[model samples]
Structures are given as C-alpha cells and as structure tokens.
Target chain A: TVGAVALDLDGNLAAATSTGGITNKLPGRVGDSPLVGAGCYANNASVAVSCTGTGEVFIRALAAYDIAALMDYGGLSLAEACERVVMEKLPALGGSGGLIAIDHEGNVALPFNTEGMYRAWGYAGDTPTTGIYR
Target chain B: GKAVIAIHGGAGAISRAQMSLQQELRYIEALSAIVETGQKMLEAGESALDVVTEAVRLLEECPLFNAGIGAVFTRDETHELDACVMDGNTLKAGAVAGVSHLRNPVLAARLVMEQSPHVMMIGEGAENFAFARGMERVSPEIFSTSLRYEQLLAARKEGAT
Candidate 1:
C-alpha cells in the first residue's frame, strides 16, 4: 500500500504498482499506476518503487521517477531527493501524497506529509515484509 | 455500487516493549487473520490484484492503522487520499493522490485505465470522470472531520502565501 522494493536483476530495475484507485470515485478517472516513470519506475542505474494512495496528482506531478531522475542527474541521495519531491515539487504543483523508494544501494525512503503510507522492504531474494503506514 | 477499495497503511514500527505478552499475541493474531483473508481469496482463484486490494482494504479499515476510517488529517485538516493500480498484463498503471473528497483514489484511476487509452489524469478531470461513471457524490461537509480541519489549517499556515 505504501512502499515497495525492487531488485537489480540482469542489471535491470523492475517496477510494479498495486492499487484500488480511489474510493467512491467517478468511474473513468485514472491515476499514475499506468504511467511509466510516474507511479513506478526503475532503471539499471537508478532505483525501484511501488506507490499507493493518490494516483492522479502523482501522475500529474510525475513524483516517483522524478526523484530518481533528480538523484541520477542531480546526484541527490535517495532520502533527501525523494523527500524533496514529495514535500516540494508535488506540493508546489498543488498535489499531495507519499512514496516508497529504494536506491540501487538498498537505501530506502518513505516520505509523505499526509497522515500515513503503507510500506515494506527486504533485500533482493529475502522474504521479509517490513513496513506499512501513513 | 461498484466495488472500490484503497490501502494506505502497512505494518510500521512497533516496539516489543510497548506490548504485553498477551497484547503481542493478540497483535500477531490480528495480523494473521488479515493475511489469511488474502490467502483464502487467492486460494479461491482470485486475481492477485483483487487479493491484494482486499487485504489492503482490511488494513485500511483497522483502527490500528492510519488509513480509511482512521486516516491521518492533512495540513488542511482533511483526510486526503492517494492510490494507484497497474494492469500487470499491460504494464498500464493508474493512480490518484492527494484527493480530499474520495474515500479511495485507486478505483478512480483504474477506471481511467480501463476506459481510456490515456496514461493518467489529475484532479478535477479525474473527479469529473468518476462522476460520469455513476459514482455517488457527497458534500465537502461529509468529508470534513476534526482531524482534517486542523490539518487544512496547518497546511495553510505552513504554505502561507
């Protein structure tokens, strides 16, 4: 619900997202889940993420991958950069929500200014379910 | 009504010292019950997506978590929501974040994916689409709560123009 981890296999980053969309929502609205590099994105040089809650704004803001891009191109740490986007870029655009992110180094950040976010993590090939919250 | 679900909480930090032996056992039992719900659904040949969504919905409803009924208030003092879904078969994803009126944004986002070819939509456009799909609409008052009102006020102060 909140965060997810990705493993580097064959030097590629695989990403996935699971959500129920929004509650009591109009039927046709779509959010970031289907958007590549929006809700979830991963690459050989970067990271992986699984986001939940608030897809529309996340899509418009391009939140998750943007953080990775900032880190990759701007050389920001996963924690600092991810927090910046969630707290700054997205909110600047009048969007709100949270994210779960992991860098290539297994560094993790779950940032959300809202009430909660759900998340969990483990190194590649390990069976550990770690976090979920606001 | 269409079945709509969203999950925004997960197992977070819980100290061993904070719980009595009996309480810890209760906690584990509660957690296992939720997991078992998912296991049963999957065993019944439900899609993985459905199983996960159902499991998360249970979490959302739990008072122990900060989602659904017990969701945290935003700086605007609102119970804003965020969510997304991916069609594993198509690699098409949908999400809705920072929504104040809706109980779940993921369902709204998925509808966009299912009904259109576009990748994403935001805010009013997304909400309007949901409305068109015959979803019920409610007044802002219905969404307002003490927790959310305080959050909204704080957000206004923190992001002061």
Candidate 2:
C-alpha cells in the first residue's frame, strides 16, 4: 500500500509518502513513493503533492514534480495542474491512480483514475472528512 | 490561523461490496483520530512539518495500515519499508528505502532532514542511521501479522493458478 500526506499552513506547504511497494515485489525494488518529484513534492510557490499508483509509470512521468512545474510555468491552477498530471499525462502512459495536493493559497485537489482511494482532508476549524469510494 | 491537511492510504480497484461494515468503520475511526490529532497540533501552532510527521508516525505504528509494523513483505517474506518527508518552508527533504528494522522510517527520514546532509538513504545505511541515533529497535517478528501472512499466501496461490 501507498500512503501520502500534503499540508498547507499560511502560505507554506509540505508533503510525505510511505509505501511497501507492489506486493511480491523483487528485493531492492524502489518505487515512486521514495523518490521526490516522482511521488512527492512541496514548494511554497505552487503546491505540495503526494502521489499513489503504479510507481514505474509515475516515475517516468515525474508525476508530483510535473504538477508543480505546470503551476509554476504554465500558470495553471492547483486543480488544473493536478488534473493534467494525474488525469491526462499519467493515463497517456498507461498509469492509473491518484494524488492529493495543496496549493500556497490552501486550495486542495484530489484526483484519481481508480475506482476507490482511501482519502481524508480538512482545514483548521473544520471537521475533517474521510472516504474510500469515488 | 489557517491550515489544511490531506492524506491518502492508497488507490486501487476497491468495491463497496468487498469491505465489510466493521472494516470500514475501523478505517474511518482511525483516519478520524489521526486527522484530529494533526489538526489539534496545527491549532496549537506546531509547524506544518511537525504536524504532518507526527500524524504519519501514528499511522506508521498502526497495524491496520501498510507501513511500519504492517508493511508488506518482499519476495523473501521479510518486511521492507520506505518513507519520505519534505519541508516546504526550506524545500528540504529526507527519505529512506528498503529498511527493515527501523520501527519508524518517517522518524529516520526527519532525522536525515534535520541531522544529515543527505536527502535519501537506503537499506543498511538507513537502519544504521536509526540505530546510531538511539531509536528503539524491535525484532523483525514485531512486523509479522497473520493477516499479512495470509494475504501473501493467497497471492502466491493465485500466482500458481
């Protein structure tokens, strides 16, 4: 399983990821979860990203980092950037999964191609919400 | 006074019919607890880095999740864990991979961020770093659970088919 976290406070953001990789994976197999820019990224200028899915495809697409790049360079919104990366770019390479991201403005995006993803989100002074289905 | 947090356990082809009501309830309860814990920390003025790390550390310790003590096994039937943490304030990050004995790879990752110059370390090096830092060590058996073992066996069985 892969677990990811993303947070925003004031104008800063941070992200983290932990995973056991694919089941029955070979020894020494490294996945997107441990590779910054592949499965996780954070920057005050744009957004923090944490990804879960097929590591191989994510690494090749540079999934998390690409979101930041799109926001920084293409001037895309956090939702737009995440959508382009997780929806368009990743699926182009036969990848399927999801990502959670928070922008400098505290805006958040959760995008996935899978049927279900275990997810939760909340803002200060608000009740946190958790779900497992689409 | 504004903060936001989001977490994901994973994404897969899961269906409502597959998860029992009790299992779903357990997951929801655990997720709520961790989120509340992190939110409280933020409310108390903890840094985003600290709050996220603390919440993840709690998740790592839970046997219901696939991290720390509940990590999945490798082909050889031993546990290997991977974790990474990053600070947006400074863009500093740390990560560890293929570590087996470190009780909390996230803590080691933070140590690497706050102590070492490296962004990532793997395998024996990561384990050694944790040990040298006086982090508690546990027998490999501490990671073993019947549920994971049974899943592995089932996977193997399907592969043989």
Residue B127 alpha-carbon offset, candidate 2, angstroms? 1.0
TM-score of chain B in each prediction: 0.67, 0.95
The candidate that wins on lDDT is 2
* Residue-level lDDT tens digits of model 1 in A1-134: 33233333222233445332332334445556545677766554676555554566677767767887789898988888877888787777776667666565656566776643444433332333433334
Off by over 4 Å in 1: A1-134, B1-8, B11-30, B139-161
Model 1 sits at an interface RMSD, in angstroms, of: 10.1
User: After superposition, which runs of candidate 2 have C-alpha atoms over 4 Å from their true positions?
Assistant: A2-10
Fnat scores for every prediction: 0.08, 0.63
TM-score of chain A of each: 0.81, 0.93
Worst 10 residues of 1 chain B by lDDT: B1-10
Please give the RMSD to the true structure for each candidate, in Å.
Answer: 9.3, 1.5
Q: Give the lDDT of residue A13 in candidate 1.
A: 36
Model 2 chain A scores worst on lDDT over the 10 consecutive residues at: A1-10
lDDT of 2 by residue, A1-134 (tens): 54445454555688888876666779899888878899888887777788889889999999988998999999999888888888888889999999888888888788998988777888876899998888
